[PDB]
Amino acid sequence: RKFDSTGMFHWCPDRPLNDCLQDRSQASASGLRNHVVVCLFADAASPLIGLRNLVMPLRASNFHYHELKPTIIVGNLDYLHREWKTLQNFPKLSILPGSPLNRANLRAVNINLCDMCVIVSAKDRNMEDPNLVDKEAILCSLNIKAMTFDDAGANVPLITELANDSNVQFLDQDDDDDPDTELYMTQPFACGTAFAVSVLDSLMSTSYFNDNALTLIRTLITGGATPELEQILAEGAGMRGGYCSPAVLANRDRCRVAQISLFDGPLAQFGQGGHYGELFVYALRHFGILCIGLYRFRDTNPSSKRYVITNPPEDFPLLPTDQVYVLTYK
Amino acid sequence: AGANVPLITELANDSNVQFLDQDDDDDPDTELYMTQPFACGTAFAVSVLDSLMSTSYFNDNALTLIRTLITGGATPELEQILAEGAGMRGGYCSPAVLANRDRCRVAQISLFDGPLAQFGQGGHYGELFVYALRHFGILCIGLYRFRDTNPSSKRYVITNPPEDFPLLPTDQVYVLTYK
Amino acid sequence: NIMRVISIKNYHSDIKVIVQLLQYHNKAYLLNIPSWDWKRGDDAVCVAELKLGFIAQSCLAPGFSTLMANLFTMRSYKPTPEMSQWQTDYMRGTGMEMYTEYLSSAFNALTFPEAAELCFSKLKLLLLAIEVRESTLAINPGPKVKIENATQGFFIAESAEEVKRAFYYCKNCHANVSDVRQIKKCKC
Ligand SMILES: [Ca+2]
Ligand SMILES: [Ca+2]
Ligand SMILES: [Ca+2]
Numbered sequence: 001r002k003f004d005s006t007g008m009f010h011w012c013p014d015r016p017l018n019d020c021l022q023d024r025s026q027a028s029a030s031g032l033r034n035h036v037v038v039c040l041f042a043d044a045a046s047p048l049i050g051l052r053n054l055v056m057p058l059r060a061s062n063f064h065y066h067e068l069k070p071t072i073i074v075g076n077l078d079y080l081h082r083e084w085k086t087l088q089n090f091p092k093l094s095i096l097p098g099s100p101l102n103r104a105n106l107r108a109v110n111i112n113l114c115d116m117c118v119i120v121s122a123k124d125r126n127m128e129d130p131n132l133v134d135k136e137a138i139l140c141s142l143n144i145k146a147m148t149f150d151d152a153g154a155n156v157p158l159i160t161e162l163a164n165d166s167n168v169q170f171l172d173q174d175d176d177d178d179p180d181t182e183l184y185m186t187q188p189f190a191c192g193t194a195f196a197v198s199v200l201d202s203l204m205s206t207s208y209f210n211d212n213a214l215t216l217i218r219t220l221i222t223g224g225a226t227p228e229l230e231q232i233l234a235e236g237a238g239m240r241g242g243y244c245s246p247a248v249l250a251n252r253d254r255c256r257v258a259q260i261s262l263f264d265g266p267l268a269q270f271g272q273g274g275h276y277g278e279l280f281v282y283a284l285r286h287f288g289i290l291c292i293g294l295y296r297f298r299d300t301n302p303s304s305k306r307y308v309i310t311n312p313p314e315d316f317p318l319l320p321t322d323q324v325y326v327l328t329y330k
Numbered sequence: 331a332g333a334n335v336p337l338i339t340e341l342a343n344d345s346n347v348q349f350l351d352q353d354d355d356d357d358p359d360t361e362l363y364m365t366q367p368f369a370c371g372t373a374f375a376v377s378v379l380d381s382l383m384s385t386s387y388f389n390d391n392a393l394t395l396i397r398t399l400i401t402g403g404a405t406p407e408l409e410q411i412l413a414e415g416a417g418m419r420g421g422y423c424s425p426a427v428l429a430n431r432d433r434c435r436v437a438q439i440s441l442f443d444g445p446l447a448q449f450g451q452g453g454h455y456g457e458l459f460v461y462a463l464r465h466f467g468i469l470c471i472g473l474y475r476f477r478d479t480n481p482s483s484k485r486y487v488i489t490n491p492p493e494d495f496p497l498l499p500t501d502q503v504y505v506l507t508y509k
Numbered sequence: 510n511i512m513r514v515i516s517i518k519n520y521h522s523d524i525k526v527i528v529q530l531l532q533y534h535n536k537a538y539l540l541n542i543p544s545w546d547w548k549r550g551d552d553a554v555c556v557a558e559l560k561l562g563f564i565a566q567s568c569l570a571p572g573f574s575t576l577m578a579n580l581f582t583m584r585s586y587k588p589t590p591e592m593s594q595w596q597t598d599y600m601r602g603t604g605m606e607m608y609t610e611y612l613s614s615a616f617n618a619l620t621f622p623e624a625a626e627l628c629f630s631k632l633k634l635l636l637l638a639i640e641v642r643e644s645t646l647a648i649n650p651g652p653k654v655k656i657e658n659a660t661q662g663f664f665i666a667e668s669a670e671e672v673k674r675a676f677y678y679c680k681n682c683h684a685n686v687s688d689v690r691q692i693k694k695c696k697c
Contacts, residue, residue: 101538104415131512138515139538146543154543170512170519173544177519338567338574340560363579369599371572374564378578379556385581386527386552389609393552395638395646395663396577400562406547413540434648438570459629463622469637469649471665472602474572477595486595487572489579489602490635490665504576506637506649 001065004241005232007248008224010059010068011241015088017081022096027072027108030094036071037114039100041136042122044078049122052086053222059090060223062256068092072109074100079122089239100140103147112149117158125163134160134167141171155304160188162196174303190307191298224254255327259295262322270318277314279324288329295323334483339367341375353482369486370477403433434506438474441501449497456493458503467508474502511538518544530555579603580665605635608664608672612639612656613697615680620652628664632674633689638663 002011022030036058038051055071070092073080077097080087087093098105100119111117121137137160145154160171168186169177171194175187188194207214218225232240262271262279270279276294283289294309296319306323339350347365348356350373354366367373386393397404411419441450441458449458455473462468473488475498485502514526522544528551530536536555545551567574579602586604588597616624621639628636638648640661647654664672674689679697686692 102415103413103541107414135512139511139541142515142543143538143541146541170515173519173522336571338564338571340564363575363582363584363603364596364600368575369596371567371575374560374567374574374578376556376560378582379554379559381582382554382559383527383529384583385607386550386554387525389607390550390552391609391640391646391661392607392663393554395607395648397562398646399648400559400566400577404558409536409540413537436566436570436573456630460626463626467622467649467651469625469635471635471637472576475595475598485572486599487576487579487602488598489576489605491598491601493630493633504570504573508649508651 001243002241003061003244003249004229004239005244006224006226006228006241007244007251008061008226008229009056009239010061010063010065010091011239012089012091014238017077017084017095020093020095022094024096024104024108027094027096028110032070032072032110033113034069034115035113036069037106037109037111037117038071038073038075039117039119039140040073040075040079040122041099041120041140042075042079044076046079046122046124048082049120050086051083051120052090054118054120055087055090055093056225057221057223059092060256061252062223062254065091069115070094072096074098074105074109075122086238101136101143103143106144106147107149111144111147111156112152114156114158117144117156119158119160121161121163130164130166133163134170137162138167138170145173159192160194162194165196165198168194168196172305187298187305187307191305192295192308193305219254220257223256224251253329255329257292258326258328258330259323260289260326262318262324263320267324268320271320271322274318275314276312276316276318279318283326290327292325292327294318295325297321338371339373341373344375344377347373347375351484366477366484366486370484371474371487372484398433399436402435403430432508434508436471437505437507437509438502439468439505441497441503442499446503447499450499450501453497454493455491455495455497458497462505469506471504471506473497474504476500511535514539514545515542518542523549525550527551528553531557533557576602580605580607582606586667604667605665606667608666608669609661610664610669610672610676612660612662612675613678614658615678616656616660616675617658619656621650621654621656622652624656625649627678628662628675631683631689632678632692633666634672634675635665636662637665 003009004011038054040051051073058069058071068091072094074096080095096105096109100106119137119140121134123136125133141158141160144156144158147153162168165183166179168183168188169179171188183189183196183198186194203214260267262268267279267283270282276291280291283291293311295306296309298305298307300319341347344362345358347362347367348358350367362368362375362377365373382393439446441447446458446462449461455470459470462470472490474485475488477484477486479498510528510530514528517524517526528539530553533555536553539545539553563574563577583606584603586601588600592600612624625636628634638646639656640646641654642657662675664675666672674692677692677695677697682694682697683692
């Protein structure tokens with residue numbers, strides 16, 4: 001298949017917007033399942049986010065073509081006509097016009113059968129008030145939680161970008177809220193439902209101290225954004241490549257991140273009775289796996305909100321419902 | 331047929347009601363409801379619906395009463411359909427659904443022709459209300475009487491007058507119908 | 510105002526929140542909040558819906574815009590001597606308002622038109638509608654719709670205490686009394 005010059009991403013030939021454009025008729029006809037939905041809020045005049053940076057790591061060369069999660073952006077045509085210059089060289093990408101507050105748009109997309117519905121706001125940040133900034137971002141998330149389907153309402157997994165940290169409290173409907181409490185301690189953040197920009201203020205300090213720690217995560221996050229790419233993109237002709245040699249295509253092997261549920265499979269024995277330390281050692285020898293942390297259910301005694309536990313102790317008891325973050329060689 | 335054209339003007343300002351009609355005593359001290367243009371149904375400011383916030387608290391059903399009587403059956407069923415974003419929809423529908431055409435709309439009944447004209451000559455409003463209710467299934471709410479009677483065609487509202495209130499042959503009566 | 514609702518409903522779900530909206534398309538956002546429940550009396554008083562609605566009914570029957578507008582502003586009849594014949598009759602109409610109160614046991618097993626007649630002729634109260642026990646709100650029904658026990662009746666009257674004469678009515682006691690202020694007696 002087609003690949004980038006570096007051998008890091010799934011490349012395509014250049015396209016016009018009308019090839020990947022869809023209406024409510026065509027989107028519902030496409031049997032979409034286990035996919036990404038970018039609920040994008042933007043005016044025509046609003047500045048670029050670079051949705052290229054969202055879609056790029058989803059189209060990493062680690063994944064096979066069938067395994068790729070097909071992304072559906074939902075926003076303005078006037079806005080996306082700008083960003084199409086960068087986005088055009090990515091497969092399984094579909095653009096649907098209109099705002100994502102309209103339920104007719106979301107029901108055509110099949111948001112109920114979504115792996116992660118990303119809510120982004122390209123609009124101008126702090127031009128009026130602090131309360132009216134994330135009006136669209138909050139109302140979209142509440143709209144999706146409120147919906148019900150008939151073949152799954154609040155069970156739609158989504159992640160909301162925020163301008164203000166204090167506006168995180170309005171997302172989830174069942175928790176104790178204080179603006180005194182910082183963004184990281186809140187229930188929506190802890191469960192991966194929110195992601196403010198303020199948490200990356202610390203990244204300026206780490207880039208000084210640990211020069212390699214910044215370039216570690218750019219491999220782990222963007223899926224091999226080598227300096228080789230950055231100089232190619234600076235030369236101005238967009239992404240390029242072709243078929244490439246077998247020496248370059250041997251660079252598909254790097255470690256991506258993945259979840260492993262302890263319900264089925266060989267690891268399920270540890271979830272019943274045993275501890276996290278016993279799981280880590282068994283998974284490492286046989287499979288080539290580093291268990292980073294857990295994604296455990298909040299309520300166990302029922303909402304489907306799971307929370308992060310990064311590197312727990314050696315003697316920490318597991319449950320059969322848990323999910324384990326892992327660095328794979330697959 | 332010049333000034334006889336019936337019209338109703340929405341207004342941003344209440345004080346600007348005075349400029350509409352050309353023959354009355356005008357004071358900005360006087361509130362919007364007391365003015366001649368409002369009383370005759372020629373004006374309708376937004377300020378008169380400030381009181382509707384209080385009634386929605388006290389009488390929960392009094393707000394949902396008028397939404398049936400005004401919008402013509404704006405059920406919550408509609409509001410959730412419209413929130414789903416595909417506009418209005420329907421088709422031909424079943425006879426069970428189409429039996430919901432029977433509800434009470436508002437209508438005027440002039441006391442010039444018809445069987446009710448006898449009451450307009452001599453009799454009172456109380457005698458009209460009782461006769462109309464038994465035979466026709468009608469609740470007379472109020473009157474829309476001519477201002478000048480002694481000639482401009484401006485009629486004014488009289489909501490639920492007394493039992494002994496004399497009628498005229500030129501009057502028009504507000505009514506809740508089953509037609 | 511939409512964000513004000515969200516912040517209240519974020520703090521506590523089970524609560525009556527009445528909102529004054531201006532544009533009708535903004536009402537769709539409040540209906541998609543999960544905590545916002547129609548059933549417990551969360552009324553979005555949309556001004557543009559009502560404003561034009563009041564006007565729209567005047568196209569069907571002119572002057573109805575100011576019939577209804579006066580029923581909801583809580584007024585009292587203060588006839589000054591400066592006013593003319595037409596104004597004093599209008600200003601009485603301003604003093605009438607919508608009221609909800611339960612009918613007495615005298616109205617039980619009795620048809621609507623006969624009940625509305627007893628309210629007008631004796632009690633001097635215009636009976637519009639009766640809520641029937643999902644509580645349906647039937648406006649001016651025919652002779653088929655009877656009055657059950659403890660039915661909430663909708664009245665146009667001068668004050669709430671005037672409508673309370675419906676609650677204290679008795680067929681045995683008050684059937685020969687012409688003075689309507691003499692029906693303050695709860696003793697039946
Ligand atoms: Ca909350
Ligand atoms: Ca004037
Ligand atoms: Ca009064």
